[PDB]
Amino acid sequence: RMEALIPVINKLQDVFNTVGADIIQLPQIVVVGTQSSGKSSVLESLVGRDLLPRGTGIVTRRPLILQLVHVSQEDKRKTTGEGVEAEEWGKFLHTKNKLYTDFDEIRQEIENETERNNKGVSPEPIHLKIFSPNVVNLTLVDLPGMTKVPVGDQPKDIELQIRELILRFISNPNSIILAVTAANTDMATSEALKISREVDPDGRRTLAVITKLDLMDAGTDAMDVLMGRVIPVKLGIIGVVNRSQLDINNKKSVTDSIRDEYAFLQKKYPSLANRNGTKYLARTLNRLLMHHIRDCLPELKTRINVLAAQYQSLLNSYGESGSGSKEAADMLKALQGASQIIAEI
């Protein structure tokens, strides 16, 4: 079937990046949320294990394009450091074709690049492909979390740069914003939903994810929110119950968590349990991204053809080293690779 489009857009995310993927306006999902929104837990429940750096320190302030590539369970490698085959592995773009079978080394490597003009915030994303038979085909551009208070309600000046970086990605007209908000907070005044209404006043291209449903105060529930009566978003409202830090320190598996999540949703939200949960979240994002890329593909393949022409006339106006011409030349070479990938189905 011809909805195998996610790997093609993955290749486009790699062929640009350095030359600038912003002007291409690639169809992708931008993950926005605060730092106590369980944002890292929503991603690790899709991966199926620990991955993201779980110690704060002074790091984890950099975009992370997470590319989950589904494989069959008969597709295995040799463990890094030469038998015993590895069911899952990973590849960083900056390390080229180096293999990563130990997920502790993968998690270490994510933190090794987030720390390396950047005054604490760097716009350059980290490209990481996770090959696994337990994930669906899905790509998520993960952005640094905001503070749960507005910018003026906290001292650190660097927070303005964080919202600048977020607006840089969600200003993409072809980006789908996945806003993550906790249930034990005032979801009508969420920092994730608030900043999404800036580039998308209606809920046209925004899907809301409500986390930590079991951490709400006694006597209330998210029934009014999970039924589409509170948050004005139009791509859907999905509630999940991810792993807590206590579960991770107790080495609870994602498999055990999604099972206990289904039980929590059947007891508390029986009439809504089939449209919520981590399993439903991954299935919806896969279909949502596939349908979105297909709709934006004819626009994208014209966008590449128009941009290369205008960059060519930009080189001639430059005349006959030169940093402006070197920038245009590299961009023209990236568009040549982009046109080849689109041409190959």
- Work out how close the CB of 294 gets to a copy of itself at its nearest, in angstroms, rounded to a whole number: 17
Query: Is 81 known to sit in a ligand binding site?
Result: no
Query: Is 36 known to sit in a ligand binding site?
Result: yes
Nearer to a copy of itself, 32 or 128 (CB): 128
- Work out how close the CB of 11 gets to a copy of itself at its nearest, in angstroms, rounded to a whole number: 7
- Work out how close the CB of 279 gets to a copy of itself at its nearest, in angstroms, rounded to a whole number: 11
Is residue 27 within 8 Å of residue 175, measured between CB atoms? yes
Query: Is 33 known to sit in a ligand binding site?
Result: yes
* Backbone angles phi and psi of 304, in degrees to 5: -65, -40
Query: Is 72 known to sit in a ligand binding site?
Result: no
Q: Which residues pair with 92 in a beta bridge?
A: 128
Nearer to a copy of itself, 98 or 116 (CB): 98
Q: How far is CA 316 from CA 19, 303, 319, 329, in A?
A: 19, 20, 5, 11
Q: What is the 3-state secondary structure (H, E, C) of 142-184?
A: ECCCECCCCHHHCCCCCHHHHHHHHHHHHCCCCEEEEEEEECC
Query: Is 212 known to sit in a ligand binding site?
Result: yes
- Work out how close the CB of 74 gets to a copy of itself at its nearest, in angstroms, rounded to a whole number: 5
3-state secondary structure of 292: helix
- Work out how close the CB of 251 gets to a copy of itself at its nearest, in angstroms, rounded to a whole number: 20
Query: Is 242 known to sit in a ligand binding site?
Result: yes
Nearer to a copy of itself, 87 or 247 (CB): 87
Gaps in the chain with C–N over 2.5 Å, residue before each: 82, 116, 320
Nearer to a copy of itself, 136 or 162 (CB): 136
- Rounded Cα distance, 276 and 165, in Å: 30
Residue of 175, 236, 227, 174 lying closest to 207 (CA atoms): 236
Residues in the site for a copy of itself, rule: CB under 8 A?
Answer: 1, 4, 7-8, 10-11, 69-75, 83, 85, 97, 129, 131, 133, 137, 283
Integer-rounded Cα Rg, in Å, for the chain is: 21
Residues making up the annotated binding site for GTP are 33-41, 211-217, 242-245
